[PDB]
Symmetry: none
Subunit: 66 residues, 4 copies
Amino acid sequence: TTGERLIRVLQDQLKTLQRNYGRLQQDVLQFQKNQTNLERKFSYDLSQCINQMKEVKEQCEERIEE
Amino acid sequence: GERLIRVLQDQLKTLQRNYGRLQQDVLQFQKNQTNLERKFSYDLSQCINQMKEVKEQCEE
Amino acid sequence: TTGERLIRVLQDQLKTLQRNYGRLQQDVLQFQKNQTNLERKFSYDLSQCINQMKEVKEQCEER
Amino acid sequence: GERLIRVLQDQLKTLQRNYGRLQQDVLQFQKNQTNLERKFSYDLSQCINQMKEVKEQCEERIEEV
């Protein structure tokens, strides 16, 4: 003992370390995998806005009674 | 005897501090990206709904 | 004029769209800023990892 | 008359290309984000992998004395 006691605190610090880091990994995995559906949603909405803009232009240009 | 263990104990407390900085950098980035996305998705929706309104103004 | 009332509505709406574009441009600029910032932080954290690794290495196996 | 209509047409068309560039800048930013995430995962893992080599090294050495 006395040196076994210190070694036990060291084992404790290491497994607290390891468990925290493992928890962070799956938090990063959670976030990043969930990011994909959002990136696709923005991409879609930006294209649609660009397409509606194109329909707007054609129709307003048609609105010529001048 | 050999207090390499007390050195290691010191290094693990430093490594725990540095993990703490890494965890807060990652989590802060994630929190800001989610808040900015709420705004980004609001502004995209606004382009869409505005463009719907212009179409019907030009269709009457 | 029916046409001159629509012209005023179209010019008001063009201003709102230009505003919308600038908010979208500022949104994308902020993604760029948050990202490069994280790249700078992560660069520092990685260096702290490698260099404390290197030194625990020499601390052990050489007493 | 169509002077104001001229410039409404001009401003709209310049806006349409600015949204176009906007769209290309989002696709590119998204993609670089993905690549930075992946290189950063790889580089931290290489550091952790060397960390673990030093653990085994330093646990072999604690009880050698």
